[PDB]
Amino acid sequence: ALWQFNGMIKCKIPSSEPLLDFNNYGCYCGLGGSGTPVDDLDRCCQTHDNCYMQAMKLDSCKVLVDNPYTNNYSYSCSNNEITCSSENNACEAFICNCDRNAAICFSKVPYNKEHKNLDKMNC
């Protein structure tokens, strides 16, 4: 769920408030997304968006009313390392992986404040 994704990013980037720093950034960070990614961070979000799209296609996810943003899963942060729990069932495990990959991606790319709250017209 969104709450866990926020926690994951904080696990890799201790100085950030994810929902404020990464939400509505570029053409893909935030609900929806299209066009050419504006930078590498935006590309991290594009990959995350695709991962969520793939999740919704899974048979295991289609039996659930929850979507990637509302489906709670289990994970832990320890020594700034993210671990998706083996107790996650198929659908939540996939989503956990999507989130973990994006959290790590965010931590390895530059942040360009200029792209915050970017106009969806540039997309």
Ligand X SMILES: COc1ccc(C(=O)O)cc1
Candidates 17-25, 35-43, 82-90, 91-99 — which segment interacts with ligand X by CB under 6 A? 17-25
First-to-last CA distance in the chain? 26
Q: Which residues define the annotated binding site for Ca(2+)?
A: 28, 30, 32, 49
Distance CA 69, CA 12 (A): 20
- 48 part of the active site: yes
**Cβ 2 vs Cβ 73: under 8 Å:** no
The residue ranges that bind ligand X (CB under 6 A) are 5-6, 18-19, 22-23, 28-31, 45, 48-49
The residue ranges that bind Ca ion (CB under 5 A) are 28, 33, 35, 49, 71-72, 92
Give me the active site residues, please: 48, 99
